[PDB]
Design a protein around this ligand. Structure first.
Ligand SMILES: [Cl-]
Lengths: 237, 237
């Protein structure tokens, strides 16, 4: 690990504070603007959708990325959530209710063993089985996110290869002639996250970032700041 | 099928001639600017990489999208081809030599049965086993491309689901918050192709286009014209 405090300007430029962590797969070297925050554990919030999805797929709770998860009929504040979804759209719109259902079907016991097998965060699911990642005991650091993602990238997680490929499909966020980004955002009403990786022709750059988000105002900076960092490091144009 | 001659302006705007074929999956309705050219069969050229890849994966010729295909040491005119590649980069750069090797390893017999099982084009592989798609007897129409792609999308082709998912990964071309495009280009030194699909939140639009390409000058119009059509039909913004 190498600390690059210069990356801090990206946060200050935006009257914000946080951490960005990068991992160069080819070189097995990591970078961050704050070695400490890089290791501060936080509630994963939406980013937990990645493991929740893997678990659901492996247990059959989710058949594939096409399967329809019919809306339960309860209108919620976020418009996009009040409709039928599939893994793809459920990830894109961060549809909590769908995932809460997955969690319930998964159940405490299977969830707990699964997170342990994944070596995910503090592996604690205390609280409601269908809300622990949002207001429970589970906590994960950015470096931890990276360790987890690297396993996923390489299909080394303790679930079927198929489940892993499907989740990676569902993580698709951006792609063009220069790179591909597979990631997941999160927001716990205090902290905002963006975790994933940038696929290049001959390398992969894993990333995990989090930042203070007192207001849903700046959710956009999660992606904005990260890219400024990627651009700065010449990972993307 | 519905014929929309208005789409012809897109070709004429560019001093070109060709065909664009669209298929609305949800509605099971197709559209094109020229019902006849839509059915004219042509050499698939690079677009054949899709089936070649599937076959290679299913037979073990290709392990996964990570496996390295070491350059044979013969310098070819196209710069990007003179290096080691993987399925991802091999598709992106349309690396003929890699695919020729796959074909040889696959062999005539297995190739022939595989294309028949796929119901691919005229299913004829006459010519060199490692060049038939470029200067041999195989021919496929745009509507035929679509039929083939629909099977792929739905994992209904006669190969493993895994092989199909991997190829679809390798077809990734573009993605953003509004759509995802999975496709493959082709060029036989007279005809240029772009085939694939546009994934939306609640629908999929398959597409296949081909156009006269006397010169490698206008290869760019394959994607340009198609998008103008997609935009026109309000499929993409
Ligand atoms: Cl993908």
């Amino acid at each position: 690990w190498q600390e690059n405090k210069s990356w801090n300007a990206h946060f200050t430029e935006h009257k914000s504070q946080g951490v960005v962590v990068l991992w160069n797969e080819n070189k097995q070297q990591g970078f961050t603007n704050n070695l400490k925050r890089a290791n501060q554990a936080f509630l994963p919030a939406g980013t937990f959708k990645i493991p929740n999805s893997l678990i659901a797929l492996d247990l059959g709770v989710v058949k594939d990325e096409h399967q329809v998860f019919k809306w339960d009929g309860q209108t919620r504040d976020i418009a996009t959530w009040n409709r039928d979804h599939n893994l793809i759209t459920a990830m894109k719109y961060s549809v909590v209710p769908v995932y809460q259902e997955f969690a319930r079907q998964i159940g405490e016991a299977r969830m707990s063993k699964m997170l342990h097998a994944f070596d995910y965060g503090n592996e604690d699911i205390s609280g409601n089985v269908d809300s622990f990642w949002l207001d429970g005991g589970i906590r994960i650091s950015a470096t931890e996110q990276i360790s987890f993602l690297r396993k996923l990238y390489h299909n080394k997680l303790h679930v079927s290869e198929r489940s892993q490929r499907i989740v990676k499909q569902a993580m698709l966020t951006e792609a063009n002639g220069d790179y591909i980004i597979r990631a997941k955002t999160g927001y716990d009403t205090k902290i905002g996250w963006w975790v994933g990786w940038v696929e290049l022709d001959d390398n992969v750059w894993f990333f995990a970032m989090n930042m203070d988000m007192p207001t849903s105002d700046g959710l956009g900076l999660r992606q904005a700041i990260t890219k400024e960092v990627l651009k700065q490091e010449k990972i993307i144009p």
